[PDB]
Design a protein around this ligand. Structure first.
Ligand SMILES: CCCCCCCCCCCCCCCC(=O)SCCNC(=O)CCNC(=O)[C@H](O)C(C)(C)COP(=O)(O)OP(=O)(O)OC[C@H]1O[C@@H](n2cnc3c(N)ncnc32)[C@H](O)[C@@H]1OP(=O)(O)O
Ligand SMILES: [Zn+2]
Ligand SMILES: [Zn+2]
Ligand SMILES: [Zn+2]
Ligand SMILES: [Zn+2]
Lengths: 287, 290
């Protein structure tokens, strides 16, 4: 169905994280770190590791199973407008049917040719920052991009969950890499030579370091998108307003831009609980 | 104030500087002297050390040039004089203040407008943007034939830097390709324990990975600009085709594949692979297809 093959990237990430939990706790902390009796380190890593581990898997879970938000029923063509639009043959006259409907909706953007943004498949008038996804077969409010590593679209409901998933990916990889670093050296100078545990300790430092540098660019890109209040699509095709194209049409200042996604309640900023302001169908404009 | 912000822009170049200085120490001292030369192969050592230095000097020369070549800014002809800028600041009508820019544009070689048929004007610099020129908020200036603000060089890629930036990507691939190709033979052996220099293990293995990660990364970045040069498009223009008097046209500056490359590298073949300024034009006006 193509759905099944879509669950392959998440199974890979699941096994790599499951392997990292067994490798970091069993092979590294119990066999290696506890094997040389260094006072006060085995416990302080296990409590900190579990703390990073739960935040990583909880944010990753939310990004996967948080269904993407769709436009409300107000943006769908009524039976009167959907009929006349389907039967109208002149492209000029069918545009007026969409334009009159757009006056009753909070729509401030148009196509590149000054055309009312309309989705022929869903038979609805696309709201601002909303785009149709051929994988999800639905319009996604404030669609950022379809992330294949979570088998879901990153939209208005997912965005803050996706960003935290990146951040906790960085800290989980940074913590593992920085803590395994001191013991990755000892197996090479041959202070330790455990045949049963050497192989697991090495990959931890390489897999965590190769994933750290990978998502780090992905994390820096979105820190710059959020400050500018742009989605991944808007960075490549800026939305067109009445006064022309403007890639900063939705910007409200770097401080207020972040709060549009994270909210004003500070107790939900770092937790993967929906705290994004607004409804996803309409967004404050700069002008 | 800005001591924290302006200095943090130099962090990406100091990171690459340390990676390169280390790669020089890792390839010459640890690999060629300690690893390769300890293995009774003085023929491969000297041929590598000179081949490495040839790529190393071309790599750092292009890198330095893309950094310290300041981007081109508009000339005083495009600035609004104190007479024209006075009447514009006082005007409140949108079309009447636009008429001010229209008569001024009849004296400038400008063939592009905005997507909404408006004269490209810059409120911060108080000038009329030349063609292909754009304003950079990081540089706080207008940049002639601006491509993109590449943070890894802490500078704008514009009309004067572009060839240096392109050669900096070319020599990065070759510097990484040469290292990846040469360290490959000795990378496999250390995993089969075929050699054991406790001190050489750390540098030789990191050499292969660091050079392999950078190669595959900049390979896409290098491939994107080779298309831009052939189409005579900047990065900004690949996102939004410019609009001329006859409408939007992504190939409005295209003069053919061969003639577009010479626009950046020049007609003198001796300057093609050298990071010395050889780009055609003045940056304020460019030949159009029509
Ligand atoms: C072994 C040792 C080897 C070492 C070897 C080292 C190798 C070294 C590489 C290492 C690893 C890198 C490999 C991966 C690469 C990355 O990690 S980073 C990828 C970044 N790629 C880029 O191209 C940089 C783009 N960054 C920008 O800021 C661009 O200018 C953007 C995308 C256009 C956005 O700019 P901005 O946010 O608007 O900021 P600003 O400075 O104000 O620029 C504004 C101008 O852009 C224009 N603009 C903005 N948005 C748009 C748009 N959607 N459409 C058209 N125009 C736009 C504005 O209109 C404006 O122009 P005007 O019309 O006003 O005059
Ligand atoms: Zn749709
Ligand atoms: Zn999708
Ligand atoms: Zn400017
Ligand atoms: Zn710049």
């Amino acid at each position: 169905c193509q759905r099944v093959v879509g669950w392959v990237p998440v199974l890979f990430i699941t096994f790599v994280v499951v392997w990292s939990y067994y490798a970091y706790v069993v092979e590294l902390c119990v066999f290696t770190i506890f094997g040389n009796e260094e006072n006060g380190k085995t416990v302080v890593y296990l409590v900190a590791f579990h703390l990073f581990f739960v935040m990583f898997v909880w944010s990753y879970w939310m990004t996967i199973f948080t269904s993407p938000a769709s436009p409300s029923k107000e943006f769908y063509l009524s039976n009167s407008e959907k009929e006349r639009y389907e039967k109208e043959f002149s492209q000029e006259r069918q545009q007026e049917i969409l334009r009159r409907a757009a006056r009753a909706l909070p729509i401030y953007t148009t196509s590149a040719s000054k055309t009312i943004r309309y989705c022929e498949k869903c038979q609805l008038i696309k709201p601002d920052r909303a785009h149709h996804c051929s994988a999800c077969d639905s319009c996604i409010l404030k669609m950022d991009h379809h992330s294949p590593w979570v088998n879901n679209c990153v939209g208005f409901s997912n965005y803050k969950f996706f960003l935290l998933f990146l951040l906790y990916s960085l800290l989980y990889c940074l913590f593992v890499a920085a803590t395994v670093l001191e013991y990755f050296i000892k197996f090479w100078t041959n202070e330790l030579t455990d045949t049963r545990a050497k192989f697991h300790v090495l990959f931890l430092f390489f897999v965590s370091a190769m994933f750290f540098i990978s998502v780090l660019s992905l994390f820096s890109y979105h820190c710059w998108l959020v400050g500018k209040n742009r989605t991944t699509i808007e960075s490549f095709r800026a939305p067109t307003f009445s006064y022309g194209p403007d890639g900063n049409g939705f910007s409200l200042g770097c401080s207020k831009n972040w709060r549009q996604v994270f909210g004003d309640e500070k107790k939900y900023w770092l937790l993967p609980i929906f705290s994004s302001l607004g409804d996803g169908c309409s967004f404050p404009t700069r002008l």
